[PDB]
Short mmCIF file of C-alpha atoms and ligand atoms in Angstrom, two decimals:
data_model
loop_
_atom_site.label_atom_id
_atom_site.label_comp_id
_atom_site.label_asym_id
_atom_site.label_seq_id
_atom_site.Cartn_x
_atom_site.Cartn_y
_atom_site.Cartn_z
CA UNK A 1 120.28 88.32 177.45
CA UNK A 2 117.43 89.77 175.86
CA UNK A 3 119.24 91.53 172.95
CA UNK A 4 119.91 88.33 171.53
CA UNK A 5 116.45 87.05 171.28
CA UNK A 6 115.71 90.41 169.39
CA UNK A 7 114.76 89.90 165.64
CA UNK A 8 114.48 86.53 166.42
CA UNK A 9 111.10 85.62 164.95
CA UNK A 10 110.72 85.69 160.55
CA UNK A 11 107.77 85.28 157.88
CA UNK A 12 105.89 86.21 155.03
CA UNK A 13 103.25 88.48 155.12
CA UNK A 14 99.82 86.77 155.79
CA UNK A 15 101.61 83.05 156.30
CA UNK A 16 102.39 83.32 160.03
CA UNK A 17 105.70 84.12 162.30
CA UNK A 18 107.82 81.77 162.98
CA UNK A 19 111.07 80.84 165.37
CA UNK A 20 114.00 78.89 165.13
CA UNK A 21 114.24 75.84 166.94
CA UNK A 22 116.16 72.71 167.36
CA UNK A 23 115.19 69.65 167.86
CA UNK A 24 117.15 65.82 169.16
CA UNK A 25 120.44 65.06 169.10
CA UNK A 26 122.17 66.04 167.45
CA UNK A 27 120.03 68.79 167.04
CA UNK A 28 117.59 69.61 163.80
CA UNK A 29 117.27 73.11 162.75
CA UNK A 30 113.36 73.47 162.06
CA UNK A 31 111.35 77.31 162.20
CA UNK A 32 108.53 76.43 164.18
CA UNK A 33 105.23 78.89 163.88
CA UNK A 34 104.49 80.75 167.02
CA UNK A 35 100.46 80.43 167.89
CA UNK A 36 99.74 81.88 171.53
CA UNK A 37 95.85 80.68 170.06
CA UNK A 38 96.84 76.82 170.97
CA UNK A 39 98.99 74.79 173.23
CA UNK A 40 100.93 72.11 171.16
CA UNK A 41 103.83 71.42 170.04
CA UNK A 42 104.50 69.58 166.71
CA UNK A 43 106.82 69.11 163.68
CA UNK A 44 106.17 67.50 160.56
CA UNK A 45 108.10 63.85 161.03
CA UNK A 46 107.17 62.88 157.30
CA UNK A 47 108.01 63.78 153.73
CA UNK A 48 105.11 66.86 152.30
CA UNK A 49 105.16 68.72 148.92
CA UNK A 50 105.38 71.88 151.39
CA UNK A 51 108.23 71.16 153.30
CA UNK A 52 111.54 71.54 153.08
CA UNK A 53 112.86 69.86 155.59
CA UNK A 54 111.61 67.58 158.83
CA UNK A 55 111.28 66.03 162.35
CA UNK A 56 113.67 62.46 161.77
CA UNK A 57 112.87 60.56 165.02
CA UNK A 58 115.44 57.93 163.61
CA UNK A 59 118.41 60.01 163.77
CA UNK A 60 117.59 61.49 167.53
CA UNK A 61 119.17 59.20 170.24
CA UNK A 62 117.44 61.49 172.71
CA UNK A 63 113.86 60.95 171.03
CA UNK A 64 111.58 58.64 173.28
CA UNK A 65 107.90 57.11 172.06
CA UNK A 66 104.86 57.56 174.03
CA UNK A 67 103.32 55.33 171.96
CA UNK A 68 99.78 57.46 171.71
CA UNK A 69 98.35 58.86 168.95
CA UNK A 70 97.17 63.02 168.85
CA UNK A 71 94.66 64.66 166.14
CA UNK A 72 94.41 68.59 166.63
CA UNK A 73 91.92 70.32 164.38
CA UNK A 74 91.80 74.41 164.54
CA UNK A 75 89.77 76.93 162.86
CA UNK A 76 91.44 75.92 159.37
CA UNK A 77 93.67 73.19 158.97
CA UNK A 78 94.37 70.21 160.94
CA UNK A 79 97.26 67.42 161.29
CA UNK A 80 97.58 64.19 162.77
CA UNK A 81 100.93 62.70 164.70
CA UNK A 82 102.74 60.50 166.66
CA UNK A 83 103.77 61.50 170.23
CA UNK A 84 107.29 62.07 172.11
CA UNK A 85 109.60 63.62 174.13
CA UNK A 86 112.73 65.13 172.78
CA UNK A 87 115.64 67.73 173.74
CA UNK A 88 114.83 71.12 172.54
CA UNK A 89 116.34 74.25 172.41
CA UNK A 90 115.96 77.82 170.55
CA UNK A 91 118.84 79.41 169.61
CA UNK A 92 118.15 82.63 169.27
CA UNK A 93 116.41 82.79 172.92
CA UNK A 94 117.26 81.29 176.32
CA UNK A 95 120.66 79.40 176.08
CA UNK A 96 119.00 76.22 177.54
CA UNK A 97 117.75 72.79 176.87
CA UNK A 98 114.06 70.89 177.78
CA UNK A 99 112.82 67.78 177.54
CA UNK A 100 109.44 68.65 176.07
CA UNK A 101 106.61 66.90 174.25
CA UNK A 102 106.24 66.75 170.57
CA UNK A 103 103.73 65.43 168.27
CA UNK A 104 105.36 64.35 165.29
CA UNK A 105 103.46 65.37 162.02
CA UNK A 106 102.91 62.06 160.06
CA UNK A 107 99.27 63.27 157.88
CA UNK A 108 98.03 66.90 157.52
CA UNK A 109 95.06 68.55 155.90
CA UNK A 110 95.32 71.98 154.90
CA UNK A 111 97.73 73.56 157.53
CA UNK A 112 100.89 73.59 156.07
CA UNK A 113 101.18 76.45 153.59
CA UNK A 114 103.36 76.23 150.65
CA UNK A 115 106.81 78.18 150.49
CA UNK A 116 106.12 79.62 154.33
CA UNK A 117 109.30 78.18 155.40
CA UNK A 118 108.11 77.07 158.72
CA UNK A 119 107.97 73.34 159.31
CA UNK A 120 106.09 73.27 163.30
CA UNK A 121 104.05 74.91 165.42
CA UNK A 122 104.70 75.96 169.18
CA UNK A 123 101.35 76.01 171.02
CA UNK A 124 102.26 78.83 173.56
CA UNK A 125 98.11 78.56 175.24
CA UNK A 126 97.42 76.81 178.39
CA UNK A 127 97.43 72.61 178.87
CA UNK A 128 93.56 73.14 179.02
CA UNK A 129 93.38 72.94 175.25
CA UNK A 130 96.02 70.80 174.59
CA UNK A 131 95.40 67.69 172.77
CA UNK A 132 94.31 64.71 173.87
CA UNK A 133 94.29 65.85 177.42
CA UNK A 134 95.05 68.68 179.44
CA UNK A 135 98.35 65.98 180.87
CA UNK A 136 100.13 67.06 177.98
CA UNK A 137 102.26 69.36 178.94
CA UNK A 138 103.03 72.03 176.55
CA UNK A 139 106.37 73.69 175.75
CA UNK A 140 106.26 76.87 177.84
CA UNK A 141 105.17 74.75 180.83
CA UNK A 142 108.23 72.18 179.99
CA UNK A 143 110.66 74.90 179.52
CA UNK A 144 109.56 76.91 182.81
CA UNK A 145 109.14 74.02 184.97
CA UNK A 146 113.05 72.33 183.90
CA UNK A 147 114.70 76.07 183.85
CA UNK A 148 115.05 79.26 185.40
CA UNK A 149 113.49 81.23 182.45
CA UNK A 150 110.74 83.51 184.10
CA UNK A 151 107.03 82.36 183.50
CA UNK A 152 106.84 85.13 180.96
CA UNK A 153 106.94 85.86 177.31
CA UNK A 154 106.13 88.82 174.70
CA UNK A 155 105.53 89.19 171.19
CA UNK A 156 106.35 92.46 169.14
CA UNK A 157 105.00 91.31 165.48
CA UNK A 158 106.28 93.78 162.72
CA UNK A 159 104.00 93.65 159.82
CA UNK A 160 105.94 95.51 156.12
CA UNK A 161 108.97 89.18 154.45
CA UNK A 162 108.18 90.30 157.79
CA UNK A 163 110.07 90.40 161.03
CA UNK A 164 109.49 90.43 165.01
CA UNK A 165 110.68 89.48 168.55
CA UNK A 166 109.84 86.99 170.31
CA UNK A 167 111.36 87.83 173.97
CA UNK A 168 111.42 84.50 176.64
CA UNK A 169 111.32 84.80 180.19
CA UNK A 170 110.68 89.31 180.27
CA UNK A 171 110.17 92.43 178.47
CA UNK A 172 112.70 93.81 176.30
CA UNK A 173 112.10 98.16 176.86
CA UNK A 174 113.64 99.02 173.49
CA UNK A 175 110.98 97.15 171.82
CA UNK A 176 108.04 99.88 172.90
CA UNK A 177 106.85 103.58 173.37
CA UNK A 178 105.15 104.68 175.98
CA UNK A 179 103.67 102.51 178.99
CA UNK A 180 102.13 99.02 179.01
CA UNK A 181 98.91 98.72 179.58
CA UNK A 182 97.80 95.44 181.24
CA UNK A 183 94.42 93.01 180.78
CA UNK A 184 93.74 90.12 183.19
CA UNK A 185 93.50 86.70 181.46
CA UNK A 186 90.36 85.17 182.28
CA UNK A 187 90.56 81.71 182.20
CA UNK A 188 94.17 79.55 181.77
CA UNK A 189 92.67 78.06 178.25
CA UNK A 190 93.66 80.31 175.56
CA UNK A 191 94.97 83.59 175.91
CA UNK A 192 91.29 84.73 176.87
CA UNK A 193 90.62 88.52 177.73
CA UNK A 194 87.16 90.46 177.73
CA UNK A 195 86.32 93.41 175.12
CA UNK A 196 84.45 95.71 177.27
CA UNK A 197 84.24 98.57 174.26
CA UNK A 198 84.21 98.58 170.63
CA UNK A 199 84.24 102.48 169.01
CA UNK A 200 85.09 103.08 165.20
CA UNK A 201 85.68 106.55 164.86
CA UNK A 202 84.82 107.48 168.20
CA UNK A 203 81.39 105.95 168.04
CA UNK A 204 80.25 103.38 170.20
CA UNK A 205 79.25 100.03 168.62
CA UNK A 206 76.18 100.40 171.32
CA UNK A 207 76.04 96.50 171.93
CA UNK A 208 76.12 94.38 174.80
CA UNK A 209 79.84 93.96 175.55
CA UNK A 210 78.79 89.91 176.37
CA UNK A 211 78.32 90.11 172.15
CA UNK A 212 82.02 91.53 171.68
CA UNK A 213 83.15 88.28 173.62
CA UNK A 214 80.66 86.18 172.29
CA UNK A 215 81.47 82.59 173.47
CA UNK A 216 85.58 84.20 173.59
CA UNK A 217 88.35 86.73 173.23
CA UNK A 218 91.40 85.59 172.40
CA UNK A 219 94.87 86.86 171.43
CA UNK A 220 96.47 84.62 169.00
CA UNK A 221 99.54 85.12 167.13
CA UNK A 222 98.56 82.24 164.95
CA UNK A 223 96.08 83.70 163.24
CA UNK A 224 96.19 86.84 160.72
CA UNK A 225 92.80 88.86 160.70
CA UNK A 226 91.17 90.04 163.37
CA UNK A 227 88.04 87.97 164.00
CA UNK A 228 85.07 89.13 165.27
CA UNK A 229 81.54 87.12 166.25
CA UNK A 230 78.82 87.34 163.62
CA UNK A 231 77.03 90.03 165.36
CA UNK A 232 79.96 92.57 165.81
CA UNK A 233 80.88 91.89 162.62
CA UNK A 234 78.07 92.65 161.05
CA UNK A 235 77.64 96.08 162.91
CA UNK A 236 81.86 96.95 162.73
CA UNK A 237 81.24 96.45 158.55
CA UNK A 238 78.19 98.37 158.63
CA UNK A 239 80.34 101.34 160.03
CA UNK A 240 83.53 100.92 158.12
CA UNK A 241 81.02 100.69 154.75
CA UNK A 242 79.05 103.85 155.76
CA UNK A 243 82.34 105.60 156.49
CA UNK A 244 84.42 104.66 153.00
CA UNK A 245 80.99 105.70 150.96
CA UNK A 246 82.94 107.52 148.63
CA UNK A 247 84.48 104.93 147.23
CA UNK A 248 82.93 101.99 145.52
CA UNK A 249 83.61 97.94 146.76
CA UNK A 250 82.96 94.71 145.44
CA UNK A 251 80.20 92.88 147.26
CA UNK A 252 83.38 89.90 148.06
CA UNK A 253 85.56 92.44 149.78
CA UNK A 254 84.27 92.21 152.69
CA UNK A 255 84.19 89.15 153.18
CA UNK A 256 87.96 89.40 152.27
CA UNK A 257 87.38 87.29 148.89
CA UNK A 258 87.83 90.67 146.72
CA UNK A 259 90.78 92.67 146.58
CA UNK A 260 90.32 96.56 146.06
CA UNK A 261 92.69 98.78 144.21
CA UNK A 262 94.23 102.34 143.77
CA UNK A 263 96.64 104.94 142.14
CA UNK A 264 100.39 103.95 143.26
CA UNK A 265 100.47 106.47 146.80
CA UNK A 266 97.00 107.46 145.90
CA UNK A 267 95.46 105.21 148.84
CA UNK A 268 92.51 107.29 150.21
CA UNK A 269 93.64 106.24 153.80
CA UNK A 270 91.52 109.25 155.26
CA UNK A 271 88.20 107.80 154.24
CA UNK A 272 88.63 104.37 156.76
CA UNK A 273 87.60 104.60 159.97
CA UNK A 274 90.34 103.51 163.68
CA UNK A 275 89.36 100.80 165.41
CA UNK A 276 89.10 100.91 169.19
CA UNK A 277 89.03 97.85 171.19
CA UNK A 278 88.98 98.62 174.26
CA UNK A 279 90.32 95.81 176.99
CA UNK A 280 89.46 95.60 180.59
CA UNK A 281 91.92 96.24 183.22
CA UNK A 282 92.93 94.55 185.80
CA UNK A 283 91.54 97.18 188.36
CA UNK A 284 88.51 98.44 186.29
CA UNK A 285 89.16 101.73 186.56
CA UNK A 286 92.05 101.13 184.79
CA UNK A 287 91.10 99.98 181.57
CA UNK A 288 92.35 100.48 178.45
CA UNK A 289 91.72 101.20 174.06
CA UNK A 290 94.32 99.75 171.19
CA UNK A 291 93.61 101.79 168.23
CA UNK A 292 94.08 100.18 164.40
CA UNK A 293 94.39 101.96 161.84
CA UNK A 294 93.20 100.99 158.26
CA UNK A 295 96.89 99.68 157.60
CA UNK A 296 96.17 96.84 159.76
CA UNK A 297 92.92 95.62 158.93
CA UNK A 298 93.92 96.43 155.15
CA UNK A 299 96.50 94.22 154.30
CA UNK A 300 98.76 94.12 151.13
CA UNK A 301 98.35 92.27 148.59
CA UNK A 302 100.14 91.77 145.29
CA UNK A 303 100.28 96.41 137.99
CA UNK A 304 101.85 99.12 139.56
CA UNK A 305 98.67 99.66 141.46
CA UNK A 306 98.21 99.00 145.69
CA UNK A 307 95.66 96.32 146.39
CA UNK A 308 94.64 95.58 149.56
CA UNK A 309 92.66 92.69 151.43
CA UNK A 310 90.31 93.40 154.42
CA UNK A 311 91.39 91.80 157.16
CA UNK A 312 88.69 91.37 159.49
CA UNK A 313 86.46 88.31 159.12
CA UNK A 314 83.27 86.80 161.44
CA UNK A 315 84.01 84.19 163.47
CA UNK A 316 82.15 81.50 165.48
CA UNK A 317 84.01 80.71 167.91
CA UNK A 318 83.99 84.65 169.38
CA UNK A 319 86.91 87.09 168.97
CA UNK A 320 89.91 86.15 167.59
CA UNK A 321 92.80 89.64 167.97
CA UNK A 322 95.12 88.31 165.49
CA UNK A 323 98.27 89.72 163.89
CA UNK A 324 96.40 92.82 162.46
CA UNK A 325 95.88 93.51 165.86
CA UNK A 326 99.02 92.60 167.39
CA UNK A 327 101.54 94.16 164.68
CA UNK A 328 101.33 97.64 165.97
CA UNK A 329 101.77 96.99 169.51
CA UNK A 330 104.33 94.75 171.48
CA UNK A 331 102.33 92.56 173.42
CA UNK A 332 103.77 90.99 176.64
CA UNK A 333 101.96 87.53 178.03
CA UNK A 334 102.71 87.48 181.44
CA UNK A 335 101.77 84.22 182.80
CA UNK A 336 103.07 84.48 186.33
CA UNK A 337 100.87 87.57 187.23
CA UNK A 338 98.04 86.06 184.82
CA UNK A 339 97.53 89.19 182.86
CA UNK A 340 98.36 90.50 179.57
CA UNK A 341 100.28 93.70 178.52
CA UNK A 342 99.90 95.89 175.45
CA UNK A 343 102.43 98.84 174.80
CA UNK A 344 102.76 101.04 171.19
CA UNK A 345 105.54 98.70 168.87
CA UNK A 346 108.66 100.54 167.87
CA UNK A 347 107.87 98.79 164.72
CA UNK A 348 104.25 100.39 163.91
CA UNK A 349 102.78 102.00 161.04
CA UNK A 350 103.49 105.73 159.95
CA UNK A 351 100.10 107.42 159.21
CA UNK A 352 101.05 110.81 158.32
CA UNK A 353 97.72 111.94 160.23
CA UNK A 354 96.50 109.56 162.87
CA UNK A 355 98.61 107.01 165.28
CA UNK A 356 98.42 103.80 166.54
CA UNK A 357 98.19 103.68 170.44
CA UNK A 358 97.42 102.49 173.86
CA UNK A 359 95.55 104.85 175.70
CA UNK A 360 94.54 105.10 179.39
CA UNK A 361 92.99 104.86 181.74
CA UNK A 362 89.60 103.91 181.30
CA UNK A 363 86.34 103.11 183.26
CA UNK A 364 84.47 99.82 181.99
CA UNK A 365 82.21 97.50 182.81
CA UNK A 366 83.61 94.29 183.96
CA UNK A 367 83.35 90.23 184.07
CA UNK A 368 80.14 90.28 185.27
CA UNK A 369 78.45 92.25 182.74
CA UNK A 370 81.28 91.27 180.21
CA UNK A 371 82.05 87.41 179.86
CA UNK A 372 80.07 84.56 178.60
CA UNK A 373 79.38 81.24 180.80
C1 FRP B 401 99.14 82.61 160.19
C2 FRP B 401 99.08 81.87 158.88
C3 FRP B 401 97.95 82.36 157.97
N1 FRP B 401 96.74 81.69 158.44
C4 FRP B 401 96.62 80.29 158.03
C5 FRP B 401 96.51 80.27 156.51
C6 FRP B 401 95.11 80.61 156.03
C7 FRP B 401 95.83 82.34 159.17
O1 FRP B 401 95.99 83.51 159.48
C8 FRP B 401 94.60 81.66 159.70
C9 FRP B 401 93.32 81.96 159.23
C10 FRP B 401 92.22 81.30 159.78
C11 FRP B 401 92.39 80.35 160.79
C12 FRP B 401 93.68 80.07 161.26
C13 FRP B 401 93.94 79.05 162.34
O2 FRP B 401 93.15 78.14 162.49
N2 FRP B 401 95.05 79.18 163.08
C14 FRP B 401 95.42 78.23 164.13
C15 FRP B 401 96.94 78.03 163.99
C16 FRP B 401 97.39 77.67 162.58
C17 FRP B 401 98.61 78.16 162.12
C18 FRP B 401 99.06 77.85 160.83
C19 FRP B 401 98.29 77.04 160.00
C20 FRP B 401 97.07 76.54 160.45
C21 FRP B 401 96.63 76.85 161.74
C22 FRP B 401 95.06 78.82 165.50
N3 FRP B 401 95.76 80.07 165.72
C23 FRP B 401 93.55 79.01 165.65
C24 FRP B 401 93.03 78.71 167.05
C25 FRP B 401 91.73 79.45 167.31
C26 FRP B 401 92.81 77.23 167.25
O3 FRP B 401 92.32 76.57 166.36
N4 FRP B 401 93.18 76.76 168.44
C27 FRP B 401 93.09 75.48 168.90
C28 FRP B 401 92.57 74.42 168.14
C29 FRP B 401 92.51 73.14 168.68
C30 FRP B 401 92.96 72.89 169.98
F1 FRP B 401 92.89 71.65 170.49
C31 FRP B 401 93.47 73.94 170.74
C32 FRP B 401 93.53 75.22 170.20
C33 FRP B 401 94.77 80.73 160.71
#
């Protein structure tokens, strides 16, 4: 049942989500980070000052070698690690078990981060990416392919320790407001969509939409900021900065090195500018916006004063929507119909003014004029 895969997902704020999992027989209890932005799925198998606990291939009788060696380095962070299959199951979702492939953590730069309580990461992306090869198969594949769990998952990230669902195989309807509002995914890779539309405060960014997806868009649950190439980030700064000219930054804000301060409940939230992404649909006519607001791409940071970090950093390797994005909205990756949806969180922050949404419909332009080859 879906109520009992409700809640399911935990964290700290700015250190990622995570699930728990188990893992051999008998099984191991390890929280294992969900990232939709790759596609595998490894444990640490080895002592680290950062963990608490680990993968012990030596105590599995289920555990099997494959006797090949896997390095996968992402934006920041890498690990390397052994491969092997494994019975696993997650007990707070479907009540099931898969033989799946896991590369076991034996040497990591970087990627762990200390006190996060999550000891693995679940690549929830396509085998395209997966490392070595694209014959890896990743979890979701494993779990679809050896079940009767629907070819289907969503996400509804709740931002302020921080909390969320992670619903497999449908759409739990208590989780959103409102309708969902569905983008096609591109290419099986990543979790790739197209930005048709950028507007921050109702003003068009006026750039070629082929900039907004500049190499990529992808949704990724792995990764905190929203990330934007160095060209729309350069223009979405220059509005947010000419828009907030009342109050006075340090030159590293922005390039979320500085923290910037106010009176306790004094937070000039009016003075920050919504930002509208707005996602092609799958019938272009139907397109749709997802509206931030400043609480998202201003995160908290810990003086009885509120600090805040800005959230949004360049990128080059194109647009990365992560949890900013995702936290007010309960986002629904529906691999069977190769699309995904976006519908307003239950769990979304309360501007006393403006609102977080998904709006619709909307005419765009489309692949053609949108997407980078
Ligand atoms: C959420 C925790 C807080 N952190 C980490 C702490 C600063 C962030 O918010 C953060 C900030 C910057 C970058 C990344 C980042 O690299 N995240 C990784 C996931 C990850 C999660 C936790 C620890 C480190 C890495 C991906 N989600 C990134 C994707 C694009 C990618 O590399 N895919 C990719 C790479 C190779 C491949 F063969 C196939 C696929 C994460």
């Amino acid at each position: 049942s879906f109520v009992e895969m409700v809640d399911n997902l935990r964290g700290k704020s700015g250190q990622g989500y995570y699930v728990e999992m188990t893992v051999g027989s008998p099984p191991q209890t390890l929280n294992i980070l969900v990232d939709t932005g790759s596609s595998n799925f490894a444990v640490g198998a080895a002592p680290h000052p950062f963990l608490h606990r680990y993968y012990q291939r030596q105590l599995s009788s289920t555990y099997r070698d494959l006797r090949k060696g896997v390095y996968v380095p992402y934006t920041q962070g890498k690990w390397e690690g052994e491969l092997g299959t494994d019975l696993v199951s997650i007990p707070h979702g479907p009540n099931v078990t898969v033989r799946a492939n896991i590369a076991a953590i034996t040497e990591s730069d970087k990627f762990f981060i200390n006190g996060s309580n999550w000891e693995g990461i679940l690549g929830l992306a396509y085998a395209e990416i997966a490392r070595p090869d694209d014959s890896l198969e990743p979890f979701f594949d494993s779990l679809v392919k050896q079940t009767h769990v629907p070819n289907l998952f969503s996400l509804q990230l709740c931002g302020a320790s921080v909390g969320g669902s992670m619903i497999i195989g449908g759409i739990d309807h208590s989780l959103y407001t409102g309708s969902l509002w569905y983008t096609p995914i591109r290419r099986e890779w990543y979790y790739e969509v197209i930005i048709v539309r950028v507007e921050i405060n109702g003003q068009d960014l006026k750039m070629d939409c082929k900039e907004y997806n500049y190499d990529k868009s992808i949704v990724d649950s792995g990764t905190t900021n929203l990330r934007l190439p160095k060209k729309v980030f350069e223009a979405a700064v220059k509005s947010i900065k000419a828009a907030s000219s009342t109050e006075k930054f340090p030159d590293g804000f922005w390039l979320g090195e500085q923290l910037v301060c106010w009176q306790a409940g004094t937070t000039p939230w009016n003075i920050f500018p919504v930002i509208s992404l707005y996602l092609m649909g799958e019938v272009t006519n139907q397109s749709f916006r997802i509206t931030i607001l400043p609480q998202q791409y201003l995160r908290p940071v810990e003086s009885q004063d509120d600090c805040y970090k800005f959230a949004i950093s360049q990128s080059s390797t194109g647009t990365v929507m992560g949890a900013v994005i995702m936290e007010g909205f309960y986002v629904v990756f529906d691999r069977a119909r190769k699309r995904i949806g976006f519908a307003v969180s239950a769990c979304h922050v309360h501007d006393e003014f403006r609102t977080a949404a998904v709006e619709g419909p909307f005419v765009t332009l489309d692949m053609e004029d949108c997407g980078y080859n």
